Amino acid sequence: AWPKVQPEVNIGVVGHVDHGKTTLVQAITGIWTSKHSEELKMTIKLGYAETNIGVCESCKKPEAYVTEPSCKSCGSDDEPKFLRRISFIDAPGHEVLMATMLSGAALMDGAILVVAANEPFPQPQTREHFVALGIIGVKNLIIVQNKVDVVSKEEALSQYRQIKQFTKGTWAENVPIIPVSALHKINIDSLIEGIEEYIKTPYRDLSQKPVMLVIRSFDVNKPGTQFNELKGGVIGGSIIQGLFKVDQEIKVLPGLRVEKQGKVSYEPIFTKISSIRFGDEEFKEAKPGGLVAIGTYLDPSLTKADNLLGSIITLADAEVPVLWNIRIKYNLLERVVGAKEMLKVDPIRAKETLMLSVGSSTTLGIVTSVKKDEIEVELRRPVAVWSNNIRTVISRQIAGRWRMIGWGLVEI
Ligand SMILES: Nc1nc2c(ncn2[C@@H]2O[C@H](COP(=O)(O)OP(=O)(O)O)[C@@H](O)[C@H]2O)c(=O)[nH]1
Ligand SMILES: [Mg+2]
């Protein structure tokens, strides 16, 4: 029947708070995103909801589209044609969402801009998310008009107009607008069809060296003491490129922090892949797409606290520079994140202490020199630079709190 494969596409869900991202994700997948549980909390709150997509050939559209191995909803006893498993990226925070997208933490091959039909468009967060979408160059964008139930058939009209006008003269000039109610499960199939049409699975260079982004780490082992029965540490993450295998030898970068009297260094952590799993199904290899769990032979202490948070996984023999001093070609956002006002950002200065997030990593840095849009930065925690223009997000000290001011590309 329907096979069991890992997800092959990451689709980000963006849009202003209370507009219905989580509800939309639940509509498509049937999963309520976690782990926010009770509102709480540098841990990366990110929900990964998965589902398979299929087409009921014997049905017409959009009803032919299903997420379960049945076509009964269409009226056929045939089995649907499996297409692909999808992974959705959802966030509890607007700040968290911006930091994830701008730092290259939330790898997405396309996205979904959630827009409430009951609020004036575009809301501030909708704008900022749009700029974010543009910057990281996700062009496969579906704009979703949500909450169409609490609005007259003619108010969504006005909204659509506003959207299409907002997009004219931009790259999103031709991106579609699909109206639905996430809450009432209305016209969701159409959105699946659209997801199939405008957000296609990209070609992936199987040759490139394997890189995993560690977005979490932990200890599976239970409270009752195993006593030598202990399962090794598990690392959760997203694979950027290439493939990892079971039993494959890998290393964690930068790795273990060592301090020899004011002498700060990092030693790569070497281990073997004991297991791979997406969801609750086990696998043999792991490619880009979706959130993976990697069973290792690590001592569960090294991984217990999301301790290897902000790290990178590569093959053990891979030549990846772990840099202490980096160069960034940066840009300043027009608005400080989540702030109401205008041009309240000064370009980067001399001895300034910043907070840089490169991927899942977060470290303090000091600017040593600054050209125009070219800054040299010295870090308290080095960064594994696995490609040329990997991205970072920049925060400076304002009023006793870290505030995102810009973003940039690392250059070597
Ligand atoms: N009337 C209506 N309400 C909705 C719809 N979708 C979500 N809501 C409500 O909006 C609130 C915010 O939903 P949520 O999914 O948490 O939004 P997000 O996570 O901020 O995108 C929830 O209390 C829902 O009850 C919709 O399609 N119609
Ligand atoms: Mg939510």
UniProtKB/Swiss-Prot annotation:
Residues 42-45 are annotated as: G2. Residues 15-22 are annotated as: G1. Changing D18A: Reduces GTP hydrolysis 8.5-fold. Completely aboloshes GTPase activity. Its EC number is 3.6.5.3. Pfam families: eIF2_C, GTP_EFTU. InterPro entries: eIF2G (IPR050543), eIF2g_C (IPR015256), eIF2g_dom_2 (IPR044127), eIF2g_GTP-bd (IPR044128), P-loop_NTPase (IPR027417), Small_GTP-bd (IPR005225), T_Tr_GTP-bd_dom (IPR000795), TIF2_gsu (IPR022424). Coiled coil: none annotated. Its cofactor is Mg(2+). It catalyses: GTP + H2O = GDP + phosphate + H(+). Residues 90-93 are annotated as: G3. The keyword Acyltransferase does not apply. GO terms for biological process: formation of translation preinitiation complex. Belongs to the TRAFAC class translation factor GTPase superfamily. Classic translation factor GTPase family. EIF2G subfamily. eIF-2 functions in the early steps of protein synthesis by forming a ternary complex with GTP and initiator tRNA. This is Translation initiation factor 2 subunit gamma. It comes from Saccharolobus solfataricus (strain ATCC 35092 / DSM 1617 / JCM 11322 / P2).
